[PDB]
Design a protein around this ligand. Structure first.
Ligand SMILES: CCCCCCCCCCCCCCCCCC(=O)OC[C@H](COP(=O)([O-])OCC(O)COP(=O)([O-])OC[C@@H](COC(=O)CCCCCCCCCCCCCCCCC)OC(=O)CCCCCCCCCCCCCCCCC)OC(=O)CCCCCCCCCCCCCCCCC
Ligand SMILES: CCCCCCCCCCCCCCCCCC(=O)OC[C@H](COP(=O)([O-])OCC(O)COP(=O)([O-])OC[C@@H](COC(=O)CCCCCCCCCCCCCCCCC)OC(=O)CCCCCCCCCCCCCCCCC)OC(=O)CCCCCCCCCCCCCCCCC
Ligand SMILES: CCCCCCCCCCCCCCCCCC(=O)OC[C@H](COP(=O)([O-])OCC[N+](C)(C)C)OC(=O)CCCCCCCCCCCCCCCCC
Ligand SMILES: CCCCCCCCCCCCCCCCCC(=O)OC[C@H](COP(=O)([O-])OCC[N+](C)(C)C)OC(=O)CCCCCCCCCCCCCCCCC
Ligand SMILES: CCCCCCCCCCCCCCCCCC(=O)OC[C@H](COP(=O)([O-])OCC[N+](C)(C)C)OC(=O)CCCCCCCCCCCCCCCCC
Ligand SMILES: CCCCCCCCCCCCCCCCCC(=O)OC[C@H](COP(=O)(O)OCCN)OC(=O)CCCCCCCCCCCCCCCCC
Ligand SMILES: CCCCCCCCCCCCCCCCCC(=O)OC[C@H](COP(=O)(O)OCCN)OC(=O)CCCCCCCCCCCCCCCCC
Ligand SMILES: CCCCCCCCCCCCCCCCCC(=O)OC[C@H](COP(=O)(O)OCCN)OC(=O)CCCCCCCCCCCCCCCCC
Ligand SMILES: NC(=O)C1=CN([C@@H]2O[C@H](COP(=O)(O)OP(=O)(O)OC[C@H]3O[C@@H](n4cnc5c(N)ncnc54)[C@H](OP(=O)(O)O)[C@@H]3O)[C@@H](O)[C@H]2O)C=CC1
Ligand SMILES: CCCCCCCCCCCC(=O)OC[C@H](COP(=O)(O)OCC[N+](C)(C)C)OC(=O)CCCCCCCCCCC
Ligand code: SF4
Ligand code: SF4
Ligand code: SF4
Lengths: 176, 45, 49, 155, 318, 342
């Protein structure tokens, strides 16, 4: 099915022709546009008072990365490199070896936050919820080097945003 | 337990308007011209 | 007359911010003089409404 | 002391510049859509004194919002060189930060910092309109800390 | 005491221009569901100060291809003539009481176009040239129509003195007998001031910035200052022509208050119109004022020359 | 030169050149070219700056990520100098001023700062030290600038004996004070010249020639303890050099002689400016000082650099000073100046 958008014929009765003549001379339809913007002047603006008011988000928000721990404090990452393999932008670099106690742990975990496309695949691929994208979106830097995170920066992010990351996961892990 | 999912209410959702609605306003062409001439005549007098 | 209720709400903001010093502090610190219910305060002094 | 008076004048000109930032109307890719949403009603960058102007000669900030290609790199430096000083550059998004999703492409400049100096890096693909607005507010606080006149006085 | 009088004229005009920028940015904002400047000073009352200081401590550059003398003369000519349009305005007592005030403003308005033509040509840029030639086209569109409209309104007043328009409209506004002329005058002032929907000499979406594309820093400010001082001046002219206020010799202050309000509301309409309509094409503007206004303006010029004669209502010569 | 300081790559921006350089006075004219060349080969550059960070921004693109490091230093603070050199293998001193400020005299920036940097560099174990003197430096000059340069050139030898001292002539380039200084005289109508510029001989050198010589001295192991004289290939008369400058710029040339004492009084008037003076009594002496012929010092050719003639690279510097009428005039339009053959 379809419909014509601009297939119409104006009635040629004298009253209609005079109505159009008044519109042409008295600018009637140009004053409706004035009336429409006049109403908006009296509507409450939709502007939030940033940084005191923040736009709403959801638990699934994909922000700054963080490396998580277990309740014991042990690192969750066991150097499986699934996040490194699935990263579309090849933003992750990992190196691992046997730890002093024998555990499988990484000696390098670098995310180039300027290659990353903030897509969430790494947290979808992680079998132990080690790597997550946190809710932080205010981490602008004054240098390109500050965005090349290493394992120390990512662990601090985890120790920093754990109280919030753990709650967001709790509210969304039943959809994953 | 029972499956819980993001589903519509049992009775469905209420009607949603989509058609163009530009209301008719103003006076007729005859009335507007009549008011216009009347203003001129008073102004001239 | 709700026109008068508008003025009283505007005056309650002055009293709801703890006087004239508080009313001007928030106006020049946040460019907003609304008064809302206090929800809590964190260890750094940030107040949430 | 004479260094106190210049410090107050330095505050004055610093205030005049961070309160009247005029970005150049310059967008490249998806990151420009989030730059429009900063001008949209919800965030309204215009209320901070930030107004877009099309001419490079009437601009104080270049927001490189999107991917920079080898074909576009000469044009970007041209409009940057034509901005009267003082001028600031804000790199928005992964593409303009370090090449982003197209870092290993034959036709993509790996970071706009290879072409022009950069003051603030806004990470994201794309950064939220609230993340770019945070970046512009960080630029303003970076201008507040300039002490040109307190360094001229001590020469 | 006359030098003080001049300063009591130009200095307030610049302050009015400075805060008309703030009013426009907020009025458009609310018509666009925004707030506009509300951070730099309470309710954005310090925004004009910041922008002025910013531009005058910014680097001004002369394009390598520019003609330096014309490049610098043009901004001076625009602001100098922008302030000169105010000295014959009765509010209610003019600074320079001219017997031919109406004609003086026409000549000064025409002379002020060359600040656009010479700025664009001196820039030696293609975008500055295109905007300059739109000024030629735009002035060819309204200049003839704008003069005859004024002539038709002066045939009810009596002379070219602007103070005499206050005497003409003492019993009744001139907008009642001449609302057809008021409509064509109002749209002619939009064209003359290069305002939307007739902002063609600049045309941001078409020419980046038009004639002033190369100007920067202080020199750009003078063009901006002149443009807004012209909006207020032309809306003051409109109020005096069609919304004449009653003059009490012993309470001249009451005139200014009523006269000031009518100019602001006419000035707000300019901001109102910029937020409501798209932009004409500079060839459609010519057809608007040559095929619609001009035929009607000539007819209304014949009518207003015959109407006083056939009703014995010819105004006094003095 | 342990494992981290072994060269790698193919001399690109992402390579490792093995050079860890501290360039003092890198925010000036000769310092932006040195940092540019060091960062082109992938060198670790430390840039101690005294000025606002806004004025160091043009230096940031000049290196890959993490290659250019900025520190804040003070000429009279010996601890700041140590923080900026203790990790470097070569130190390059480019500090200088063409005038005197209320806070730093000519002997503060040419005798004390150069000696402070040299001493701390030796105490910190730095291996190479490159000091930029002036060609016309000697104790018995009419210019404090040149008198102080000779003294500083001597304190460096006594403090860092293995230092490589380079003595350039007047350097011409884009952001220079030699060709731009002459062209900008057009604002004052005529071009004053002491003895009408007929008794002064100048041998200007190109900035890239000086920049490539300094880089070569770092990599060449035989440049230690040797004083070099970087000069151009041709010697000109000041009248002919200035006349050529106005010919390239297509500006009217109206020279007139002015007594040496009168040119000093004029220079004294310009020195009152609380900003960069247009001219000083010292600049007048330097401009009208014959460039020394030092055949006993090795030149650019001893570092593998071919001196660039002034003619080939003068239009790039002076095209900015032309009007729209003469912007497009080609290089081959102005006849070359007259040289002083040996
Ligand atoms: C009762 C009394 C009341 C009387 C009321 C009557 C009022 C009279 C009307 C008002 C007067 C308006 C005058 C018209 C403007 C001048 C015309 C013009 O533009 O020619 C430019 C013309 C071209 O120069 P240019 O544009 O610099 O060259 C292009 C280059 O690209 C340029 O590139 P560049 O690299 O050379 O630029 C660098 C330069 C650029 O410097 C500038 O920008 C000059 C700024 C001047 C601003 C003038 C507006 C104020 O910077 C400098 O170094 C400055 C020093 C160099 C001198 C500057 C050049 C002076 C030119 C003459 C002015 O200059 C001349 O050739 C001068 C010749 C003499 C012209 C007179 C002929 C006009 C006759 C009509 C007027 C009648 C005379 C009396 C009038 C005055 C009454 C006392
Ligand atoms: C009396 C004049 C007698 C005739 C002069 C000799 C004729 C030369 C014929 C050569 C030729 O074919 O082309 C014309 C000849 C060269 O033209 P072109 O190189 O082929 O084309 C570009 C133009 O040169 C355009 O070059 P430009 O844009 O660089 O011109 C700069 C300057 C021309 O440069 C100057 O001549 C100014 C310097 C001379 C005065 C200073 C003398 C030294 C005083 C001692 C220093 C004391 C300093 C104290 C502080 O002219 C001005 O803009 C200032 C005029 C403002 C008048 C108001 O044009 C001239 O510059 C000569 C006229 C300069 C005198 C202006 C007289 C205006 C009437 C009064
Ligand atoms: C702020 C404080 C109040 C501001 C002033 C009030 C706002 C007035 C402008 C907005 C009016 C609201 C829109 C509206 O009602 O118009 C719809 C109406 C409807 O227009 P229409 O296009 O739908 O058709 C009406 C006419 N027929 C049907 C015959 C075609 O528009 C008008 O009728 C406007 C008529 C006024 C004509 C005056 C023109 C001459 C003006 C001379 C100068 C005085
Ligand atoms: C570049 C900027 C140059 C200045 C721009 C102004 C151009 C000239 C303005 C014309 C003056 C005028 O007509 O006033 C009429 C007005 C009209 O008034 P009036 O004609 O009704 O008479 C007033 C007095 N009664 C009524 C009693 C007879 O004249 C006056 O009010 C007073 C006249 C004083 C004498 C003025 C003449 C000398 C001014 C010459 C300046 C010429 C400069 C031209 C440069 C143009 C190049 C850009
Ligand atoms: C959409 C754009 C087109 C609309 C543009 C309209 C903008 C101009 C608005 C003019 C409206 C009339 C003025 C009302 C507000 C100012 C009234 C005022 O201060 O003076 C009292 C005015 C009367 O003051 P008055 O002095 O003019 O007296 C009336 C006129 N004579 C002199 C003939 C007696 O009162 C009103 O305007 C009430 C209406
Ligand atoms: C005009 C006066 C009103 C005349 C009128 O409306 O009467 C109805 C009559 C028939 O109308 P209809 O059958 O629909 O079609 C026109 C056929 N001739 O309409 C007609 O037949 C009139 C035929 C047109 C003649 C008039 C055309 C010239 C324009 C007249 C302007 C009228 C409006 C002026 C304002 C009037 C109010 C002051
Ligand atoms: C700026 C210009 C402001 C003018 C705005 C006029 C207001 C228009 C208006 O009121 O439109 C809405 C109103 C709707 O009412 P309603 O008739 O019930 O709608 C259903 C009818 N189908 O429509 C109306 O009722 C119209 C009421 C206003 C009519 C004004 C008369 C027309 C005048 C035309 C001539 C213009 C010249 C008059 C002289 C002016 C000099 C002061
Ligand atoms: C239509 C155009 C006329 C518009 C009205 C003109 C202004 C007016 O109304 O003036 C009316 C005036 C009445 O006189 P008044 O002011 O009361 O003087 C007594 C004071 N003690 O009297 C006048 O000033 C004018 C009186 C004549 C009316 C003007 C039109 C001429 C009349 C021509 C009559 C011929 C028939 C007209 C119809 C055929 C034309 C198509
Ligand atoms: N005509 C020429 O160019 C010649 C150059 N030379 C020598 O080469 C070196 C650089 O010359 P050039 O680049 O042309 O001159 P510039 O003025 O362009 O550079 C001067 C540099 O030294 C710094 N400087 C000056 N005074 C101080 C001070 N008290 N404390 C700290 N830093 C200071 C400046 O720092 P900042 O800008 O931040 O204030 C700047 O970085 C100088 O030693 C000069 O004598 C010798 C022969 C010819
Ligand atoms: C056409 C009219 C102007 C012409 C140009 C001359 C005025 C230039 C302004 C600076 C002069 C100057 O040197 O300012 C000196 C004064 C006080 O002197 P001081 O601190 O004892 O001197 C120290 C001199 N130093 C800096 C070389 C060490 O510094 C100020 O705090 C003034 C700064 C604000 C000036 C007003 C704005
Ligand atoms: S969010 Fe996507 S692009 Fe970023 S690190 Fe994870 S997988 Fe890679
Ligand atoms: S997917 Fe998880 S466990 Fe595997 S390497 Fe990445 S962060 Fe470590
Ligand atoms: S950083 Fe992301 S949003 Fe921005 S241009 Fe690149 S892919 Fe698009």
């Amino acid at each position: 099915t379809y419909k014509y958008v601009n297939l119409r014929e104006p009635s040629m009765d004298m009253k209609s022709v005079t109505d159009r003549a008044a519109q042409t001379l008295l600018w009637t339809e140009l004053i409706r546009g004035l009336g429409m913007t006049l109403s908006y002047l009296f509507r409450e603006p939709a502007t939030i008072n940033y940084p005191f008011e923040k736009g709403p988000l959801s638990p699934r928000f994909r922000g700054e990365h963080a490396l998580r721990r277990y309740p014991s404090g042990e690192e969750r990452c066991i150097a499986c490199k699934l996040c490194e393999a699935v990263c579309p932008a090849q933003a992750i670099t990992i190196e691992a070896e046997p730890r002093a106690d024998g555990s499988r742990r990484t000696t390098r975990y670098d995310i180039d936050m300027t290659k990353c496309i903030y897509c969430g695949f790494c947290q979808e691929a992680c079998p132990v919820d080690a790597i997550v994208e946190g809710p932080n979106f205010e981490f602008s830097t004054e240098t390109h080097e500050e965005l090349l995170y290493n394992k120390e920066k990512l662990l601090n992010n985890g120790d920093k945003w754990e109280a919030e990351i753990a709650a967001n996961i709790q509210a969304d892990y039943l959809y994953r | 337990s029972k499956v819980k999912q993001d589903m519509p209410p049992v009775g469905g959702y209420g009607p949603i308007d989509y058609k163009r609605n530009l209301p008719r306003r103003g006076l007729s062409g005859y009335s507007m011209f009549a008011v216009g001439i009347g203003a001129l005549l008073f102004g001239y007098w | 007359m709700e026109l008068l209720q508008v003025l009283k709400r505007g005056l309650q903001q002055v009293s709801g911010h703890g006087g004239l010093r508080g009313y001007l502090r928030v106006l020049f610190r946040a460019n907003d003089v609304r008064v809302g219910t206090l929800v809590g305060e964190d260890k750094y002094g940030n107040k949430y409404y | 002391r004479g260094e106190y008076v210049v410090a107050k004048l330095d505050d004055l000109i610093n205030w005049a510049r961070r309160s009247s930032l005029w970005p150049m109307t310059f967008g490249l890719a998806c990151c420009a859509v989030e730059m429009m949403h900063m001008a949209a009603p919800r965030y309204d960058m215009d209320r901070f004194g930030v107004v877009f102007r099309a001419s490079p000669r009437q601009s104080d900030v270049m927001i490189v919002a999107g991917t920079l290609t080898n074909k576009m790199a000469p044009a970007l430096r041209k409009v940057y060189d034509q901005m009267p000083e003082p001028r600031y550059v804000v790199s928005m998004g992964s593409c303009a930060n370090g090449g982003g999703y197209y870092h290993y492409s034959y036709s993509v400049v790996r970071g706009c910092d290879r072409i022009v100096p950069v003051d603030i890096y806004v990470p994201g693909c794309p950064p939220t309109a609230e993340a770019l607005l945070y970046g512009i507010l960080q630029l303003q606080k970076k201008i507040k800390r300039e002490k040109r006149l307190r360094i001229w006085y001590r020469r | 005491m006359f030098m003080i009088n001049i300063l009591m004229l130009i200095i307030p005009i610049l302050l009015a221009v400075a805060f008309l920028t703030l009013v426009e940015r907020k009025v458009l904002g609310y018509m666009q569901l925004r707030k506009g400047p509300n951070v730099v000073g309470p309710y954005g009352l310090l925004q004009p100060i910041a922008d002025a200081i910013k531009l005058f401590i910014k680097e001004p550059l002369r394009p390598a291809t520019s003609s330096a003398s014309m490049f610098i003369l043009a901004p001076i000519m625009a602001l100098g003539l922008a302030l000169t349009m105010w000295i014959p305005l009765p509010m209610p007592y003019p600074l320079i009481n001219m017997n031919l005030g109406v004609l003086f403003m026409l000549a000064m308005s025409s002379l002020a176009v060359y600040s656009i033509l010479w700025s664009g040509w001196a820039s030696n840029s293609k975008y500055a040239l295109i905007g300059a030639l739109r000024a030629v086209a735009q002035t060819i569109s309204y200049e003839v129509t704008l003069a005859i409209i004024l002539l038709s309104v002066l045939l009810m007043s009596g002379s070219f003195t602007l103070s005499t328009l206050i005497t003409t409209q003492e019993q009744m506004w001139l907008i009642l007998p001449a609302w057809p002329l008021a409509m064509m005058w109002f749209i002619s002032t939009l064209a003359e001031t290069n305002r939307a929907p007739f902002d063609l000499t600049e045309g941001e979406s078409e020419l980046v910035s038009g004639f002033n594309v190369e100007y920067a820093a202080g020199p750009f400010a003078l063009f901006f200052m002149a443009e807004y001082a012209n909006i207020i001046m032309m809306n003051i002219f409109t109020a005096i022509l069609f919304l004449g206020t009653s003059h009490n010799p012993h309470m001249p202050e009451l005139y200014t208050i009523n006269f000031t309000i009518k100019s602001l509301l006419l000035t707000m309409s300019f901001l109102w119109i910029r937020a409501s309509y798209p932009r004409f094409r500079y060839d459609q503007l010519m057809h608007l004022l040559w095929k619609n206004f001009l035929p009607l303006t000539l007819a209304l010029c014949m009518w207003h020359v015959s109407l006083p004669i056939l009703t014995s209502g010819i105004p006094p010569q003095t | 030169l342990h494992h981290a300081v072994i060269p790698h790559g193919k001399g690109g921006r992402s390579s490792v050149s093995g050079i860890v350089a501290t360039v003092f006075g890198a925010t000036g004219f000769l310092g932006r070219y040195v940092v540019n060349h060091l960062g082109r080969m992938g060198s670790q550059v430390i840039v101690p700056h005294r000025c606002e960070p806004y004025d160091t921004m043009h230096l940031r693109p000049m290196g890959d990520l993490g290659q250019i490091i900025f520190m804040d230093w003070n000429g009279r603070d010996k601890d700041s100098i140590r923080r900026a050199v203790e990790h470097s293998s070569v130190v390059i001193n480019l500090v200088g001023r063409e005038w005197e400020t209320q806070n730093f005299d000519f002997e503060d920036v040419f005798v004390k700062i150069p000696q402070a940097i040299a001493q701390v560099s030796k105490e910190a174990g730095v291996e190479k030290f490159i000091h930029i003197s002036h060609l016309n430096a000697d104790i018995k000059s009419s210019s404090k600038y040149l008198r102080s340069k000779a003294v500083g050139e001597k304190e460096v030898r006594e403090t860092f004996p293995e230092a490589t001292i380079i003595k350039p002539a007047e350097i011409f380039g884009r952001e220079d004070r030699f060709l731009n200084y002459f062209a900008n005289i057009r604002w004052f109508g005529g071009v004053p010249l002491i003895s009408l510029g007929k008794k002064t001989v100048k041998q200007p050198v190109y900035i890239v020639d000086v920049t490539k010589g300094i880089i070569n001295a770092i990599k060449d192991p035989d440049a230690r303890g040797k004083t070099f004289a970087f000069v151009g290939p041709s010697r000109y008369l000041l009248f002919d050099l200035v006349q050529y400058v106005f010919a390239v710029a297509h500006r009217p040339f109206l020279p007139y002689p002015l007594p040496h004492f009168a040119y000093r009084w004029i220079g004294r008037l310009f020195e009152i400016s609380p900003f960069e003076p247009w001219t000083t009594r010292d600049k007048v002496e330097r401009i009208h000082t014959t460039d020394k012929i030092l055949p006993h010092l090795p030149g650019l050719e001893d570092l593998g650099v071919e001196a660039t003639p002034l003619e080939l690279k003068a239009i790039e510097v002076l095209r900015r000073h032309r009007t729209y009428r003469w912007l497009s005039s080609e290089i081959e339009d102005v006849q070359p100046a007259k040289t002083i053959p040996t």
